[PDB]
Symmetry: C3
Subunit: 445 residues, 3 copies
């Protein structure tokens, strides 16, 4: 039986933020979420998460996927662990104590932490790591037989102890029953003082050493937040590359934790993919493309464009400098060119809009052609209207389509026309001015 | 006499691609091409390239610059080298065996490989390298006199041999005659088994050690492809910096292998230069500028813009957010502003188009001024027409020029005009509507 | 008493530039300026800067903040220091000799250099550093008692001396009086030969060792210029992160030396902030945003946009792909959308311009709405006019406003209208064409 307690009560003053430290994001989700995900690797029978500062905000994040307990005042990690008492004391198993500000720790590492605690029948196993610059961290003191004696911080550290490279990551696995009993024995309570109690009784204490020290990073400020962003960024992009995705520069490409990318997808440097984004097979993404919560089919080419909460079928060609705003759909083989904005509209297959065009709140059929400079109007300073555009409609360049209006199938709008009324199918609509040339007049200008 | 065999038959399954592994690109050209380029450094009397998977595709790449031989089924490097038999066996010299998936290997290194093979009168010289993590590679076993005894992989590797840091790069130089005779002696044939034959006869075998281990990289997946991209990117940008080109961030600037850049050229981070692109002296390129197969004169400023298959004279100012599409020319001192697209058109010197304008299929003279919002129409849903614009023509803002039409020299198009007929020189053309004010009417809106 | 001499006479041939080497920029200001800034940390009673090549250009940079002396021909560092004679010889103190091509050297390091020179009563203290690749640099020879004997370059370096890791950074602190007297004793004069004179007299010579070797970088070419850019970039971004600014990628974000950023400001990768730029609290900046000499209030969101010499109040939402040109102001909560350009205009609070719009030379009130495709005209091929737009004016989509004109409060411009005359308050202005439908006509197209 395995149990788990997630520490997430500290405020994080070095962050210079009012947001709970653990809620700061890394590659899409909060640090707390990354921690919770690694936890499930040991399939915890019960999971308790200690909260404190702005408990409301935090509870919204992991609501329903773990139990909670509130900590009034910051009375240390010991008091924090004591809040888990009403729910855990009286259960046989291994209770892992992990902080929520260590996003890089992986599930496999926690499995390894649990397997070690069992294999060595320890009463308390400490996840440690080695570094050639141990300044600040508590050091793991052992003996000639490699047995873990005690953790000593830089307040009780003698010169001989000040050289120990093996440090404490602040992540442990304790024997449930013994843990809460030893907490009653111990100006703040430290979870580390629990090891002192076990020592007096000569109870078995071990230490699992993390292979990658950097995986133990504890985020206390934004400098470390960026480092977490760095490790996580590399991790994610590595996986994608193994999955058959080419990266011009995986070190400078920004893909969120939950983004899905098919094989053969080619991604240039400086591409941003955020939220619930999916990329179909063979799709090409160029430098500057920014996608938020969108689905992109296969064989599509997104050249330096921004796509938010929209769907993009296969064969779609977009950009450069195009903007696909929320609630839009681009049918197969649709072409959206430079300086074109599509907002809250559905675009049928093969429709072309290659230049300086605004399509807002429109239902557009297939094989439609938007001439450069076409503007659709839906707002009047109060109300929002809709326009229906049929299949095979040719919309003249520099035209203005004023909603509500419907352009029937195979309709044609003359260039420079201002359309206020419906255009029946197969009809042509013109509404501009006639050209008048005046000789020798450009001489007076 | 020096000979050369280029191995390029493997499929590369870890790539998760149907494209031949060696054809994957790095900084503009295929890995195979980078390899071929290093080869010519030893001026090979004859060059044979072993192919296999999709031989057609590969042959198009190096057609006419090297001989070829096809390998039916993947029967190992030994069989691959045996395909070179009909063309090489019976020649006196040094035959270099290099794989096409090692893009970073330089010509100077191969020269050094050939010079070592000669200076030491070896029958087989192995290009090796040292690493502190030799897991996977075959290890070079020597003796107390430093003589190369044999290569041992991780299948015959004893614990004492499992610690050797000197590994085999998979690149060799063999004595031509002996090579093909020893191949007849040896479930797949390995080019490494050839060294076993030489050992039995006590024939001289040496090893040239690469100074930079990373130069030996063998691309088997996209992770390594990106690493090659990384090394090659740095290499190219280093050269440019030595040639007098400033880089804000050479680690995050993407310049293809054959791009030419003059001195004093200033390049901000995140600039992309692809294909046959040339940059004149003192030209400034800002973050986001993307250039494909284009020539740019001196003293030009390209601010966050995209230029494809076009020519840009000196003093040209472009951007930000401008798009110069295929088959365009921008005369000297031409100014193209934000959200302006130029497609298949010639633009005379000093012509200005600073805002939200589309110029497609036009021949434009010098000193022309395109008012913001000017649209040129050439397409009607079937045909593409052309428009001629003379010198000193002032094109009114928000005007629509409908091809085929000609605006004579010093002509003027009134703002908001829709032009369908030619405008004679020195004439003015207007074709809009008159303004009508209605008092107290905006009260009912 | 502390004195200072700044060496800035070399041309820098490996730069392949006509600009004085020291004037090349790093994170906004010249290398020379970074040097001068570190100098003031020791509060120099008198500061002399040695110049030579294009002395005019250099003097403009540090004019009034330091004294100058010109060097006719390049006769070495010794001659350069001798130019300081007329102003310094005859003063009691410590004269620091620093070159202007070492931008990374910090003020704290120079303070430490001065404090060491005093604490050890040296006649000449040498700022040295250790590296495992000392090729090229002069090596600090000491003895069994750690006393500094002499500096030996790679021309007099014996094999035993060729292994010394401690090198000379080219930065020193000499006893003023002795310095200029020893210069008269010594085909070019070297400041290093001064140590030889002190040795003959057995005068005390020490060496302060820089903790960070990379801080000693001397820029001789653009490769090193980029490295300086790299260190300086990291330094600046580190400070900001400590000040509470989040960075997705501090390694790929470009912020000039004097930029000011408030806490809680969120900055995505690839953001550029240049010159005298200020960022208010909580403001969000996305990938591609480029800001030059501008002020941005709090809570603003700048999505992939370019803002030059302008002011942006709080709550302003900009982008993507927007261009705020010189001399503009955006009142609170102003919204500027994609492909919109604002030039030399003031925009009142809550005014919206969300699409393909050009606003040049306009004074615009609050609560104004610019419909997509709105164009303002101010140029006629000679003169520049101005337009006044009141509060609550609704400007129709695809309209053309021709200056000089005034749109009174609560005015309305019909979509597609070409406005040439003032529109009184509460009035509506229309000037387009009527729609005419022709049945079965789109059949012949």
């Amino acid at each position: 039986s395995n149990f788990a307690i997630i520490l997430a009560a500290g405020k994080g003053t070095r962050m210079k933020s009012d947001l709970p430290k653990v809620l700061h994001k890394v590659a899409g989700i909060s640090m707390l979420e990354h921690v919770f995900r690694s936890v499930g690797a040991i399939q915890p029978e019960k999971t308790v998460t200690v909260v404190g500062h702005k408990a409301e905000l935090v509870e919204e994040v992991l609501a329903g996927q773990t139990e909670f307990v509130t900590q009034s005042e910051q009375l240390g990690t010991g008091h924090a662990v004591m809040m888990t008492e009403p729910i855990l004391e009286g259960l046989s198993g291994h209770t892992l104590v992990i902080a929520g500000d260590t996003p890089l720790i992986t599930g496999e590492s926690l499995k390894n932490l649990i397997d070690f605690h069992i294999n060595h029948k320890n009463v308390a196993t400490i996840l440690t790591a080695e570094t050639d610059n141990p300044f600040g961290y508590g050091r793991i003191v052992r003996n000639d037989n490699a047995e873990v004696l005690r953790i000593v911080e830089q307040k009780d550290a003698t010169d001989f102890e000040k050289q120990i490279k093996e440090i404490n990551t602040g992540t442990y696995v304790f024997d449930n029953e013994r843990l809460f009993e030893a907490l009653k024995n111990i100006g703040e309570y430290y979870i580390t003082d629990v090891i002192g109690i076990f020592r007096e009784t000569g109870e078995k204490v071990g230490a699992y050493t993390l292979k990658d020290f950097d995986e133990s990073l504890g985020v206390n400020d934004r400098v470390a937040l960026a480092t977490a962003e760095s490790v996580m960024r590399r991790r994610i992009n590595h996986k994608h590359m193994v999955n058959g995705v080419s990266f011009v520069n995986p070190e400078a490409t920004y893909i969120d934790i939950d983004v899905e990318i098919a094989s053969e997808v080619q991604i240039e440097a400086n591409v941003t993919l955020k939220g619930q984004t999916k990329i179909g097979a063979e799709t090409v993404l160029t430098n500057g493309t920014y996608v938020v919560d969108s689905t992109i089919g296969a064989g599509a080419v997104i050249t330096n464009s921004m796509i938010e909460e929209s769907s993009v079928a296969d064969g779609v060609i977009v950009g450069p400098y195009a903007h696909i705003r929320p609630n839009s759909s681009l049918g197969a083989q649709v072409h959206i060119g430079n300086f074109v904005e599509v907002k809250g509209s559905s675009i049928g297959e093969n429709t072309k809009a290659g230049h300086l065009t605004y399509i807002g709140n429109c239902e557009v059929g297939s094989n439609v052609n938007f001439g450069a400079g076409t503007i659709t109007v839906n707002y009047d300073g109060k109300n929002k209207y809709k326009t229906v555009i049929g299949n095979n409609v040719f919309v003249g360049s520099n035209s203005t389509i004023i909603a509500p209006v419907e352009l029937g199938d195979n309709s044609l709008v003359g260039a420079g026309s201002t359309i206020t009324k419906d255009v029946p199918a197969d009809a042509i609509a013109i509404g501009r001015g006639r050209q008048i040339n005046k000789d020798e007049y450009a001489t007076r200008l």
